[PDB]
Amino acid sequence: EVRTIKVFTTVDNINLHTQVVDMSMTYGQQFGPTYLDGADVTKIKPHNSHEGKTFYVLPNDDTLRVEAFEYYHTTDPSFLGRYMSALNHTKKWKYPQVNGLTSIKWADNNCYLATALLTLQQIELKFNPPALQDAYYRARAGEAANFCALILAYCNKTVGELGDVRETMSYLFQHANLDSCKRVLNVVCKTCGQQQTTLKGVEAVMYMGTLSYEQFKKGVQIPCTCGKQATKYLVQQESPFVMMSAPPAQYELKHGTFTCASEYTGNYQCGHYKHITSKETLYCIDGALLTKSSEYKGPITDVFYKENSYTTTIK
Ligand SMILES: CCNC(=S)N/N=C/c1cc(O)ccc1O
Ligand SMILES: [Cl-]
Ligand SMILES: [Cl-]
Ligand SMILES: [Cl-]
Ligand SMILES: [Zn+2]
């Protein structure tokens, strides 16, 4: 007896492609690698309950290649498999609302993803890939499973891997519209003189070396090629936020002097992030957990500040 069902294949879960599948054969034999809401059904034969359902496949014809690139803005061949594999886990995570923001209950070392997600909801940022636009919209509303899986895929992290918040934000920033952002810096060595530099996009909003936006404006000491120590300070800044980062060190966060920050406790190969946000008071969101304090001191590695336009006074 020949037995078939109709299903739909997709790469973006919007554009559907009608298929007829033979119930005596696996999905793999008919589509190649096949997924049902994240689950790998490649080695599985069609079930009656599969009729009418949407299955993800890999882009193995030109029409799917174009749909996938337009939706995700990547042509990494392993992207979709990595996204599905992550999603099969992130759809089981919980996404509690904590002080008005979508967080993530701790699981699978995802603390770095929680503080990244919490941070995104406090800074002005638009993603370019439609996949991130759509998934971020849902994540804000509370259904963050697809967004978290996409973050993992874009950053080439698997569920359970330890992540770095700064690196994760770098990847997300690459897929955001920061074209308007501009940074002008000046480096002063007393043996070589001055030298001014201009940064754009992602490099205009990220700095590594100090957590303090004010100290960045006043000046910070760095090496120079002659062996002398030079001073770098901020000449001009155009962006809706800035991100200051440093290796984790004890730091004091004051209410109303910053938007949010990331705290890291542990070592290089093992640790835990928490999120601090400055609202009517200082709230520490640790996944599903919430505490408050008027003052805060702890090992801070990233601090986020609001900005529109800043011009320096140093002549
Ligand atoms: C450079 C050769 N590939 C082309 S033009 N399409 N591939 C697209 C594509 C492939 C993936 O694995 C994931 C997402 C995608 O958008
Ligand atoms: Cl089966
Ligand atoms: Cl899991
Ligand atoms: Cl967006
Ligand atoms: Zn010099």
mmCIF file of C-alpha atoms and ligand atoms in Angstrom:
data_model
loop_
_atom_site.group_PDB
_atom_site.id
_atom_site.type_symbol
_atom_site.label_atom_id
_atom_site.label_comp_id
_atom_site.label_asym_id
_atom_site.label_seq_id
_atom_site.Cartn_x
_atom_site.Cartn_y
_atom_site.Cartn_z
ATOM 1 C CA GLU A 1 0.000 0.000 0.000
ATOM 2 C CA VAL A 2 1.513 3.400 -0.985
ATOM 3 C CA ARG A 3 0.818 5.885 1.798
ATOM 4 C CA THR A 4 1.644 9.583 1.786
ATOM 5 C CA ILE A 5 0.931 12.819 3.603
ATOM 6 C CA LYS A 6 1.282 16.487 2.713
ATOM 7 C CA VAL A 7 3.741 18.550 4.761
ATOM 8 C CA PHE A 8 5.480 21.892 4.283
ATOM 9 C CA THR A 9 9.185 22.560 4.289
ATOM 10 C CA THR A 10 10.727 25.919 5.165
ATOM 11 C CA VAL A 11 13.930 27.667 6.056
ATOM 12 C CA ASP A 12 12.330 30.775 7.647
ATOM 13 C CA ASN A 13 8.987 29.465 9.022
ATOM 14 C CA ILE A 14 7.142 32.045 6.847
ATOM 15 C CA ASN A 15 7.581 30.902 3.246
ATOM 16 C CA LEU A 16 6.160 27.402 2.994
ATOM 17 C CA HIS A 17 6.883 24.797 0.327
ATOM 18 C CA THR A 18 4.348 22.049 -0.338
ATOM 19 C CA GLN A 19 5.724 18.522 -0.234
ATOM 20 C CA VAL A 20 4.326 15.015 -0.544
ATOM 21 C CA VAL A 21 6.259 12.488 1.517
ATOM 22 C CA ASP A 22 6.278 8.702 1.423
ATOM 23 C CA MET A 23 5.349 7.306 4.819
ATOM 24 C CA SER A 24 7.600 4.283 4.237
ATOM 25 C CA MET A 25 10.716 6.494 4.093
ATOM 26 C CA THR A 26 12.451 8.717 6.608
ATOM 27 C CA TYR A 27 12.460 12.478 6.249
ATOM 28 C CA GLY A 28 16.206 12.264 5.750
ATOM 29 C CA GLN A 29 15.802 10.073 2.672
ATOM 30 C CA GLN A 30 13.422 12.642 1.191
ATOM 31 C CA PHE A 31 14.641 16.086 2.356
ATOM 32 C CA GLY A 32 18.040 15.621 3.928
ATOM 33 C CA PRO A 33 18.340 16.906 7.503
ATOM 34 C CA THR A 34 14.826 17.687 8.740
ATOM 35 C CA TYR A 35 13.568 19.296 11.939
ATOM 36 C CA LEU A 36 10.166 19.686 13.603
ATOM 37 C CA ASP A 37 10.142 22.687 15.947
ATOM 38 C CA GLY A 38 13.818 22.044 16.733
ATOM 39 C CA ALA A 39 13.632 18.261 17.024
ATOM 40 C CA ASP A 40 15.783 16.329 14.564
ATOM 41 C CA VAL A 41 13.365 14.071 12.631
ATOM 42 C CA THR A 42 15.905 13.086 9.952
ATOM 43 C CA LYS A 43 15.919 9.402 10.986
ATOM 44 C CA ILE A 44 12.144 9.303 11.609
ATOM 45 C CA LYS A 45 9.390 8.205 9.249
ATOM 46 C CA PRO A 46 6.319 10.398 8.661
ATOM 47 C CA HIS A 47 3.499 10.023 11.187
ATOM 48 C CA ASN A 48 -0.208 10.585 10.576
ATOM 49 C CA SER A 49 -0.086 13.527 12.982
ATOM 50 C CA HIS A 50 2.538 15.190 10.779
ATOM 51 C CA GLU A 51 0.069 16.031 7.996
ATOM 52 C CA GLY A 52 -0.059 19.761 7.372
ATOM 53 C CA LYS A 53 2.877 20.564 9.647
ATOM 54 C CA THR A 54 5.922 22.703 8.869
ATOM 55 C CA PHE A 55 9.395 21.169 8.874
ATOM 56 C CA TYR A 56 12.701 23.030 8.687
ATOM 57 C CA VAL A 57 15.187 21.788 6.110
ATOM 58 C CA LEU A 58 18.557 22.906 4.879
ATOM 59 C CA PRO A 59 18.872 25.266 1.886
ATOM 60 C CA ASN A 60 19.498 22.624 -0.795
ATOM 61 C CA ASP A 61 18.028 24.520 -3.778
ATOM 62 C CA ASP A 62 18.431 28.103 -4.953
ATOM 63 C CA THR A 63 15.019 29.262 -3.784
ATOM 64 C CA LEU A 64 15.769 28.137 -0.207
ATOM 65 C CA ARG A 65 19.280 29.598 -0.282
ATOM 66 C CA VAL A 66 17.870 33.023 -1.138
ATOM 67 C CA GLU A 67 15.098 32.744 1.493
ATOM 68 C CA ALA A 68 17.597 31.684 4.175
ATOM 69 C CA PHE A 69 20.104 34.408 3.424
ATOM 70 C CA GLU A 70 17.423 37.104 3.308
ATOM 71 C CA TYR A 71 16.015 35.941 6.648
ATOM 72 C CA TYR A 72 19.249 35.238 8.562
ATOM 73 C CA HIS A 73 22.025 37.201 6.759
ATOM 74 C CA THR A 74 24.411 34.232 6.937
ATOM 75 C CA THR A 75 25.533 31.500 4.522
ATOM 76 C CA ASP A 76 27.270 29.331 7.118
ATOM 77 C CA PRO A 77 26.161 25.820 6.053
ATOM 78 C CA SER A 78 25.834 24.623 9.648
ATOM 79 C CA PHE A 79 23.785 27.615 10.838
ATOM 80 C CA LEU A 80 20.327 26.071 10.581
ATOM 81 C CA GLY A 81 21.314 22.824 12.256
ATOM 82 C CA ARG A 82 22.930 24.781 15.097
ATOM 83 C CA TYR A 83 19.843 27.002 15.430
ATOM 84 C CA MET A 84 17.488 24.007 15.557
ATOM 85 C CA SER A 85 19.702 22.166 18.045
ATOM 86 C CA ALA A 86 19.751 25.183 20.345
ATOM 87 C CA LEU A 87 16.010 25.733 19.944
ATOM 88 C CA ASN A 88 15.213 22.215 21.011
ATOM 89 C CA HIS A 89 16.660 23.259 24.399
ATOM 90 C CA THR A 90 15.727 26.924 24.646
ATOM 91 C CA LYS A 91 12.045 26.135 24.054
ATOM 92 C CA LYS A 92 12.151 24.219 27.368
ATOM 93 C CA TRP A 93 13.695 27.120 29.319
ATOM 94 C CA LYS A 94 11.536 29.499 31.332
ATOM 95 C CA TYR A 95 11.358 33.229 30.638
ATOM 96 C CA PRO A 96 9.975 34.964 33.733
ATOM 97 C CA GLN A 97 9.192 38.661 33.697
ATOM 98 C CA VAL A 98 11.481 40.242 36.332
ATOM 99 C CA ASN A 99 10.910 43.904 37.189
ATOM 100 C CA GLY A 100 9.187 44.388 33.863
ATOM 101 C CA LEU A 101 11.822 42.710 31.677
ATOM 102 C CA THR A 102 12.038 39.289 30.068
ATOM 103 C CA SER A 103 14.678 37.238 31.874
ATOM 104 C CA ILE A 104 15.712 33.577 31.746
ATOM 105 C CA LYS A 105 15.496 31.086 34.600
ATOM 106 C CA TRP A 106 18.960 29.649 35.083
ATOM 107 C CA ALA A 107 19.770 26.476 33.103
ATOM 108 C CA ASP A 108 22.633 25.167 30.950
ATOM 109 C CA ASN A 109 25.057 27.970 31.922
ATOM 110 C CA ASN A 110 22.768 30.535 30.286
ATOM 111 C CA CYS A 111 23.456 33.344 32.737
ATOM 112 C CA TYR A 112 25.412 35.276 30.063
ATOM 113 C CA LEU A 113 22.403 35.049 27.765
ATOM 114 C CA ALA A 114 20.094 36.324 30.485
ATOM 115 C CA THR A 115 22.173 39.419 31.176
ATOM 116 C CA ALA A 116 22.584 40.056 27.451
ATOM 117 C CA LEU A 117 18.817 39.798 26.958
ATOM 118 C CA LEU A 118 18.075 41.995 29.933
ATOM 119 C CA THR A 119 20.600 44.513 28.626
ATOM 120 C CA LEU A 120 19.116 44.635 25.116
ATOM 121 C CA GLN A 121 15.770 45.653 26.599
ATOM 122 C CA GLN A 122 17.357 48.747 28.142
ATOM 123 C CA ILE A 123 19.294 50.138 25.157
ATOM 124 C CA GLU A 124 18.121 51.468 21.799
ATOM 125 C CA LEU A 125 19.081 48.967 19.121
ATOM 126 C CA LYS A 126 17.472 47.650 15.935
ATOM 127 C CA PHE A 127 18.538 44.391 14.350
ATOM 128 C CA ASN A 128 19.037 44.048 10.607
ATOM 129 C CA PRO A 129 18.335 40.319 9.963
ATOM 130 C CA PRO A 130 14.580 39.728 9.903
ATOM 131 C CA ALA A 131 15.178 36.580 11.927
ATOM 132 C CA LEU A 132 16.473 38.726 14.829
ATOM 133 C CA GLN A 133 13.830 41.423 14.380
ATOM 134 C CA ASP A 134 11.011 38.905 14.605
ATOM 135 C CA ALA A 135 12.535 36.813 17.400
ATOM 136 C CA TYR A 136 13.491 39.885 19.474
ATOM 137 C CA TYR A 137 9.942 41.215 19.184
ATOM 138 C CA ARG A 138 8.684 37.912 20.621
ATOM 139 C CA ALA A 139 11.366 37.882 23.315
ATOM 140 C CA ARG A 140 10.291 41.332 24.549
ATOM 141 C CA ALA A 141 6.763 39.953 24.809
ATOM 142 C CA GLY A 142 8.052 36.986 26.830
ATOM 143 C CA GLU A 143 8.558 34.226 24.235
ATOM 144 C CA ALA A 144 12.343 34.373 23.992
ATOM 145 C CA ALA A 145 13.110 30.765 23.001
ATOM 146 C CA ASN A 146 13.768 31.530 19.321
ATOM 147 C CA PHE A 147 15.804 34.652 20.129
ATOM 148 C CA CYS A 148 18.005 32.750 22.577
ATOM 149 C CA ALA A 149 18.530 29.935 20.055
ATOM 150 C CA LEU A 150 19.466 32.487 17.403
ATOM 151 C CA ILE A 151 21.959 34.187 19.728
ATOM 152 C CA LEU A 152 23.616 30.836 20.279
ATOM 153 C CA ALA A 153 23.707 30.083 16.548
ATOM 154 C CA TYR A 154 25.034 33.503 15.576
ATOM 155 C CA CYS A 155 27.767 33.336 18.266
ATOM 156 C CA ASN A 156 28.649 29.680 17.527
ATOM 157 C CA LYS A 157 27.940 28.648 21.099
ATOM 158 C CA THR A 158 26.051 25.468 21.955
ATOM 159 C CA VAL A 159 23.661 25.121 24.859
ATOM 160 C CA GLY A 160 25.723 24.575 27.990
ATOM 161 C CA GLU A 161 28.876 26.297 26.775
ATOM 162 C CA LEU A 162 30.243 29.111 28.905
ATOM 163 C CA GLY A 163 29.781 32.450 27.168
ATOM 164 C CA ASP A 164 31.302 35.933 27.494
ATOM 165 C CA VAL A 165 28.845 38.821 27.683
ATOM 166 C CA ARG A 166 31.123 41.271 25.863
ATOM 167 C CA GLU A 167 31.746 38.861 22.964
ATOM 168 C CA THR A 168 28.043 38.052 22.732
ATOM 169 C CA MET A 169 27.127 41.731 22.526
ATOM 170 C CA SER A 170 29.797 42.194 19.854
ATOM 171 C CA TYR A 171 28.080 39.565 17.674
ATOM 172 C CA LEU A 172 24.621 41.035 18.194
ATOM 173 C CA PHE A 173 25.974 44.514 17.512
ATOM 174 C CA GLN A 174 27.427 43.291 14.208
ATOM 175 C CA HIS A 175 23.860 42.415 13.144
ATOM 176 C CA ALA A 176 22.382 45.743 14.259
ATOM 177 C CA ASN A 177 22.133 49.115 12.566
ATOM 178 C CA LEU A 178 24.820 51.189 14.256
ATOM 179 C CA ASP A 179 25.890 52.987 11.088
ATOM 180 C CA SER A 180 25.068 56.366 12.676
ATOM 181 C CA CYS A 181 27.472 55.789 15.599
ATOM 182 C CA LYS A 182 30.730 57.761 15.629
ATOM 183 C CA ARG A 183 33.592 58.065 18.102
ATOM 184 C CA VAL A 184 36.607 60.394 18.012
ATOM 185 C CA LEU A 185 39.580 59.677 20.269
ATOM 186 C CA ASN A 186 42.901 61.422 20.918
ATOM 187 C CA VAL A 187 46.105 59.664 22.114
ATOM 188 C CA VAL A 188 48.789 61.869 23.754
ATOM 189 C CA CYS A 189 52.361 60.631 24.227
ATOM 190 C CA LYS A 190 54.851 63.210 25.469
ATOM 191 C CA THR A 191 57.610 61.885 23.153
ATOM 192 C CA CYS A 192 55.587 61.283 19.949
ATOM 193 C CA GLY A 193 52.976 64.041 20.374
ATOM 194 C CA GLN A 194 49.300 63.522 19.536
ATOM 195 C CA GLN A 195 47.280 61.317 17.205
ATOM 196 C CA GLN A 196 43.517 61.383 16.659
ATOM 197 C CA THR A 197 41.441 58.403 15.524
ATOM 198 C CA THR A 198 37.832 57.924 14.446
ATOM 199 C CA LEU A 199 35.732 54.797 14.991
ATOM 200 C CA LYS A 200 32.396 53.843 13.430
ATOM 201 C CA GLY A 201 29.644 51.341 14.050
ATOM 202 C CA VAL A 202 30.361 48.668 16.616
ATOM 203 C CA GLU A 203 33.824 49.997 17.427
ATOM 204 C CA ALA A 204 32.254 53.397 18.154
ATOM 205 C CA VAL A 205 30.117 52.042 21.052
ATOM 206 C CA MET A 206 32.409 49.397 22.651
ATOM 207 C CA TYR A 207 35.556 50.040 24.684
ATOM 208 C CA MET A 208 37.789 47.565 26.536
ATOM 209 C CA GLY A 209 40.089 48.706 29.332
ATOM 210 C CA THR A 210 37.927 50.716 31.747
ATOM 211 C CA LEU A 211 34.388 50.560 33.093
ATOM 212 C CA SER A 212 33.993 54.294 33.787
ATOM 213 C CA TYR A 213 32.527 56.535 31.102
ATOM 214 C CA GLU A 214 33.705 59.574 33.087
ATOM 215 C CA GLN A 215 37.312 58.345 33.325
ATOM 216 C CA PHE A 216 37.158 57.661 29.558
ATOM 217 C CA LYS A 217 36.250 61.329 29.085
ATOM 218 C CA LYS A 218 39.001 62.548 31.446
ATOM 219 C CA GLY A 219 41.738 60.209 30.163
ATOM 220 C CA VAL A 220 43.178 56.722 30.636
ATOM 221 C CA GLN A 221 46.767 55.517 30.450
ATOM 222 C CA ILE A 222 47.888 53.023 27.790
ATOM 223 C CA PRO A 223 51.219 51.921 26.260
ATOM 224 C CA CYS A 224 52.991 53.513 23.306
ATOM 225 C CA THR A 225 55.571 52.169 20.874
ATOM 226 C CA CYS A 226 58.559 54.001 22.420
ATOM 227 C CA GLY A 227 57.995 52.545 25.905
ATOM 228 C CA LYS A 228 56.257 55.712 27.186
ATOM 229 C CA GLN A 229 52.731 55.767 28.664
ATOM 230 C CA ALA A 230 50.227 57.838 26.674
ATOM 231 C CA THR A 231 46.813 59.224 27.623
ATOM 232 C CA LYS A 232 43.663 58.385 25.645
ATOM 233 C CA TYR A 233 40.486 60.420 26.118
ATOM 234 C CA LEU A 234 37.139 60.804 24.353
ATOM 235 C CA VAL A 235 36.927 63.687 21.893
ATOM 236 C CA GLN A 236 33.399 63.215 20.545
ATOM 237 C CA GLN A 237 30.627 60.627 20.749
ATOM 238 C CA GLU A 238 27.437 60.107 18.745
ATOM 239 C CA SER A 239 25.376 57.064 19.765
ATOM 240 C CA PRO A 240 22.269 56.132 21.805
ATOM 241 C CA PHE A 241 24.367 54.174 24.321
ATOM 242 C CA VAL A 242 27.928 53.181 25.054
ATOM 243 C CA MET A 243 29.347 49.964 26.485
ATOM 244 C CA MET A 244 32.422 50.054 28.714
ATOM 245 C CA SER A 245 34.154 46.773 29.541
ATOM 246 C CA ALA A 246 37.181 45.546 31.469
ATOM 247 C CA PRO A 247 38.420 42.376 33.057
ATOM 248 C CA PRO A 248 36.319 41.627 36.172
ATOM 249 C CA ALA A 249 37.377 43.849 39.094
ATOM 250 C CA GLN A 250 35.724 45.122 42.299
ATOM 251 C CA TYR A 251 33.805 48.210 41.232
ATOM 252 C CA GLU A 252 31.215 50.468 42.840
ATOM 253 C CA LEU A 253 27.993 51.162 40.908
ATOM 254 C CA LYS A 254 26.051 54.310 41.957
ATOM 255 C CA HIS A 255 22.319 54.767 41.420
ATOM 256 C CA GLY A 256 21.569 57.053 38.475
ATOM 257 C CA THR A 257 25.092 57.111 36.978
ATOM 258 C CA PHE A 258 24.638 54.244 34.502
ATOM 259 C CA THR A 259 21.911 52.205 32.807
ATOM 260 C CA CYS A 260 22.853 48.603 33.553
ATOM 261 C CA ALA A 261 25.896 46.436 34.051
ATOM 262 C CA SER A 262 27.156 42.851 34.126
ATOM 263 C CA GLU A 263 28.784 41.297 37.245
ATOM 264 C CA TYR A 264 31.035 38.234 36.808
ATOM 265 C CA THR A 265 31.977 35.968 39.779
ATOM 266 C CA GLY A 266 34.393 33.119 39.137
ATOM 267 C CA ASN A 267 37.463 32.338 37.038
ATOM 268 C CA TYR A 268 38.337 32.184 33.362
ATOM 269 C CA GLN A 269 36.994 28.655 32.790
ATOM 270 C CA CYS A 270 34.023 28.830 35.187
ATOM 271 C CA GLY A 271 31.817 31.511 36.704
ATOM 272 C CA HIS A 272 28.448 33.208 36.946
ATOM 273 C CA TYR A 273 27.060 36.450 35.574
ATOM 274 C CA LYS A 274 24.408 38.632 37.174
ATOM 275 C CA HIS A 275 22.709 41.777 35.920
ATOM 276 C CA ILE A 276 22.404 45.100 37.774
ATOM 277 C CA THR A 277 19.941 47.746 36.501
ATOM 278 C CA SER A 278 19.589 51.300 37.838
ATOM 279 C CA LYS A 279 15.874 52.185 38.141
ATOM 280 C CA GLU A 280 14.173 53.842 41.119
ATOM 281 C CA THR A 281 16.862 51.861 43.004
ATOM 282 C CA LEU A 282 19.512 49.267 42.145
ATOM 283 C CA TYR A 283 18.040 45.882 41.188
ATOM 284 C CA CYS A 284 20.161 42.769 40.693
ATOM 285 C CA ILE A 285 18.475 40.280 38.366
ATOM 286 C CA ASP A 286 20.024 36.820 38.569
ATOM 287 C CA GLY A 287 17.959 34.804 36.110
ATOM 288 C CA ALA A 288 14.595 34.416 37.858
ATOM 289 C CA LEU A 289 15.970 35.926 41.117
ATOM 290 C CA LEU A 290 15.623 39.577 42.157
ATOM 291 C CA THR A 291 17.175 41.585 45.001
ATOM 292 C CA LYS A 292 17.585 45.326 45.492
ATOM 293 C CA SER A 293 20.063 47.661 47.184
ATOM 294 C CA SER A 294 20.782 51.386 47.423
ATOM 295 C CA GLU A 295 24.534 50.884 46.852
ATOM 296 C CA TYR A 296 26.364 48.217 44.960
ATOM 297 C CA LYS A 297 29.996 46.974 44.876
ATOM 298 C CA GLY A 298 31.047 43.775 43.116
ATOM 299 C CA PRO A 299 33.137 42.362 40.345
ATOM 300 C CA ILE A 300 31.823 44.313 37.321
ATOM 301 C CA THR A 301 32.968 43.550 33.772
ATOM 302 C CA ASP A 302 30.550 45.538 31.541
ATOM 303 C CA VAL A 303 28.699 48.806 32.200
ATOM 304 C CA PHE A 304 26.166 50.421 29.833
ATOM 305 C CA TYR A 305 25.506 54.154 29.699
ATOM 306 C CA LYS A 306 22.983 56.315 27.858
ATOM 307 C CA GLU A 307 24.267 58.775 25.253
ATOM 308 C CA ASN A 308 23.070 61.036 22.482
ATOM 309 C CA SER A 309 25.867 63.464 21.638
ATOM 310 C CA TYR A 310 28.955 64.341 23.660
ATOM 311 C CA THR A 311 31.783 66.781 22.855
ATOM 312 C CA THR A 312 34.893 67.228 25.036
ATOM 313 C CA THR A 313 36.339 70.333 26.631
ATOM 314 C CA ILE A 314 40.016 69.225 26.590
ATOM 315 C CA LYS A 315 41.757 71.558 24.130
HETATM 316 C C1 LIG B 1 27.223 31.456 -0.071
HETATM 317 C C2 LIG B 1 26.388 30.240 -0.496
HETATM 318 N N1 LIG B 1 25.088 30.140 0.176
HETATM 319 C C3 LIG B 1 23.999 30.800 -0.209
HETATM 320 S S1 LIG B 1 24.002 31.923 -1.456
HETATM 321 N N2 LIG B 1 22.859 30.592 0.510
HETATM 322 N N3 LIG B 1 22.894 30.008 1.758
HETATM 323 C C4 LIG B 1 22.126 30.551 2.625
HETATM 324 C C5 LIG B 1 22.064 30.127 4.014
HETATM 325 C C6 LIG B 1 22.729 28.959 4.435
HETATM 326 C C7 LIG B 1 22.695 28.548 5.765
HETATM 327 O O1 LIG B 1 23.268 27.383 6.163
HETATM 328 C C8 LIG B 1 22.024 29.308 6.691
HETATM 329 C C9 LIG B 1 21.375 30.479 6.322
HETATM 330 C C10 LIG B 1 21.416 30.875 4.993
HETATM 331 O O2 LIG B 1 20.903 32.098 4.689
HETATM 332 CL CL CL B 2 9.821 6.196 12.717
HETATM 333 CL CL CL B 3 17.789 22.011 28.135
HETATM 334 CL CL CL B 4 14.806 44.830 16.036
HETATM 335 ZN ZN ZN B 5 55.430 57.702 22.212
#
